[PDB]
Design a protein around this ligand. Sequence first.
Ligand SMILES: *[C@@H]1O[C@H](CO)[C@@H](O[C@@H]2O[C@H](CO)[C@@H](O[C@@H]3O[C@H](CO[C@H]4O[C@H](CO[C@H]5O[C@H](CO)[C@@H](O)[C@H](O)[C@@H]5O)[C@@H](O)[C@H](O[C@H]5O[C@H](CO)[C@@H](O)[C@H](O)[C@@H]5O[C@H]5O[C@H](CO)[C@@H](O)[C@H](O)[C@@H]5O)[C@@H]4O)[C@@H](O)[C@H](O[C@H]4O[C@H](CO)[C@@H](O)[C@H](O)[C@@H]4O[C@H]4O[C@H](CO)[C@@H](O)[C@H](O)[C@@H]4O)[C@@H]3O)[C@H](O)[C@H]2NC(C)=O)[C@H](O)[C@H]1NC(C)=O
Ligand SMILES: *[C@@H]1O[C@H](CO)[C@@H](O)[C@H](O)[C@H]1NC(C)=O
Ligand SMILES: *[C@@H]1O[C@H](CO)[C@@H](O)[C@H](O)[C@H]1NC(C)=O
Lengths: 206, 214, 170
Amino acid sequence: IVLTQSPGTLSLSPGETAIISCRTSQYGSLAWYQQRPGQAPRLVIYSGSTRAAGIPDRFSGSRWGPDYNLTISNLESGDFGVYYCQQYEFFGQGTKVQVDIKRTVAAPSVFIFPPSDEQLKSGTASVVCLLNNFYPREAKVQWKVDNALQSGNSQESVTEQDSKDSTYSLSSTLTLSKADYEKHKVYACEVTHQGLRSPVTKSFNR
Amino acid sequence: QVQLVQSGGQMKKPGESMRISCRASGYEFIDCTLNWIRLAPGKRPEWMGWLKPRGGAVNYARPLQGRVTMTRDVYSDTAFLELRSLTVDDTAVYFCTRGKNCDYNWDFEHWGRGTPVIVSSPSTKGPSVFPLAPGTAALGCLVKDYFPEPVTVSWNSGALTSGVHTFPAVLQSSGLYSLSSVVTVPSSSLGTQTYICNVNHKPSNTKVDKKVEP
Amino acid sequence: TITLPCRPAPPPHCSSNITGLILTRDGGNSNAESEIFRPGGGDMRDIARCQIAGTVVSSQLFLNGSLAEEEVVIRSVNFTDNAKSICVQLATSVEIACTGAGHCAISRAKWANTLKQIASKLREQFGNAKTIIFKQSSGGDPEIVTHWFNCGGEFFYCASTQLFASTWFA
Ligand SMILES: *[C@@H]1O[C@H](CO)[C@@H](O[C@@H]2O[C@H](CO)[C@@H](O[C@@H]3O[C@H](CO[C@H]4O[C@H](CO[C@H]5O[C@H](CO)[C@@H](O)[C@H](O)[C@@H]5O)[C@@H](O)[C@H](O[C@H]5O[C@H](CO)[C@@H](O)[C@H](O)[C@@H]5O[C@H]5O[C@H](CO)[C@@H](O)[C@H](O)[C@@H]5O)[C@@H]4O)[C@@H](O)[C@H](O[C@H]4O[C@H](CO)[C@@H](O)[C@H](O)[C@@H]4O[C@H]4O[C@H](CO)[C@@H](O)[C@H](O)[C@@H]4O)[C@@H]3O)[C@H](O)[C@H]2NC(C)=O)[C@H](O)[C@H]1NC(C)=O
Ligand SMILES: *[C@@H]1O[C@H](CO)[C@@H](O)[C@H](O)[C@H]1NC(C)=O
Ligand SMILES: *[C@@H]1O[C@H](CO)[C@@H](O)[C@H](O)[C@H]1NC(C)=O
């Protein structure tokens, strides 16, 4: 029995509502814990919608079927941090309400990097997808090999919102080994973003 | 006013045993079931077991079944957690908790300040640096398969500041961190200027310098 | 016929019928292939809340208590809650016999039959078909770990380590 929280990282400015979702796989009262940086985690909501001690009415829990929502009506500094959902002994992966300076929308400049030949000798092969200077942080990257989607073989990372830019950059590390890699000749990285009219694709041949 | 005061942070070597105390006052100790939860960075919270003080009844989480043992002392109002056969995975901040109400066990209102443990194998893995090469162009370095955190990269020994983005490391299934560090430069510049990234990894004392040739 | 290491040796009149028992359920989950069950792990409030008890004060095993009609009946406040004790009541009792020599004998085949009934009912509650493991207690005081009961104002400690060491499939 597992608990799935979405989104993984929710980011937005102070003074606006934050909404977190937790999908359950079984019945049983569900709790919500806030964890500020460096501090012990704090019980926010229990039994679905009832608030614990010292929790303001800006926090509310909502449930429909197997889905649970924690909505924080008015974001204050103390609310930012990482939230977990719980059902009996099991926890959700977590969500990270972090600050986000609002600015104009910027489309990502995309680059694709074929694996180093020396790495290819070592037996492995890492294709990298770079997305630079885009707003907002929410953006989807899709790995296709010979026009075929891939799952779980890839990993991601996003920069802190760069002070000058107020803009996010993302790196997607697609990892394979020499065998599978050489077999498929052609690879493509697909980027879908708010500031983008059409899903920009960046590809290459072996 | 319930208080859960626990032991101070520890450093342990891999394969060793660990004992942590947690004494509590503000409520009648024998009444409420006590739990242990470890929080690993970038990892799901994990419940270790509960311990019912009246008779010392105990329920260990199944993944930890062999290596976890927790006991209690009724008279000084305290509970002890013991973790044997430590592995680098087991580095976490360890909390003792008690529920809001005395027996619905799972609404953890009360937490200790936490006891951070750090098992770190003297075995370290040097970074493997692999170049990334192509209006404007981008070229970078892939710092793959190193251990443990952290590494600090730079460019041209610090001559390059603008356009450089170093990314938070990523834990591959290998158990080894791999991050990337890219920089955007003019397309013309590819021929004119040489671009060297400087990977500095203090845990292994390795300091790799790598060139990104077009 | 399984015997019990018992301290101290229990006189013949202490020999009695077993009515039910207390099972604590090991916290999951791994993969829902199997479930682990252990005796006791139940506070006195759990025992009282169970309401099947007789006169005899005991841990792990209900003694001299009321039987339930036809099928073995399992009850808990919430089965998905592993912090809550599972109460098991039997339609057919199991006569635990103490010689007075220090070892309490018991019908092994009969206890196998009752256990199979319990496992069947546990599957009914915990999903159509999960393999069920019966292991000895995780730890605690002798009264919780060992089967402990009171006879004539005197306490006795018997080890159910031999008892709870089974595994059932379906
Ligand atoms: C251990 O303890 C825990 C608690 O800590 C126990 O967990 C509880 O277990 C309960 C029973 O197992 C369980 O009740 C269920 O819940 C079902 C789901 O409930 C949610 O979803 C409802 C809508 O679902 C629809 O959509 C989803 C997906 O979209 C589908 O999966 C569904 O099939 C539907 O299509 C939703 O309405 C409901 O909210 C109501 O209830 C909340 C209570 O928490 C209220 O806060 C909320 O406002 C809603 O209240 C409305 O409805 C109630 C009446 O239900 C009414 O009093 C209010 O005034 C208001 O009008 C959740 O969001 C749900 O489908 C079940 O309901 C059916 O079965 C019951 C009988 O049990 C019927 O009386 C009822 O009419 C309904 O009939 C359906 O089933 C019939 C046959 O079963 C069938 O004939 C008929 O056609 C219908 O299909 C039932 O309530 C709890 O949800 C759960 N609690 C938690 C927190 O998880 C756990 O069980 C314990 N463990 C053990 C082992 O005992
Ligand atoms: C239980 O009942 C039997 C007969 O019903 C009796 O002999 C015995 O003394 C009672 N008490 C115990 C602890 O067995
Ligand atoms: C247990 O109960 C049976 C009948 O229910 C009875 O014959 C027997 O004497 C009782 N006591 C023992 C120790 O078996």
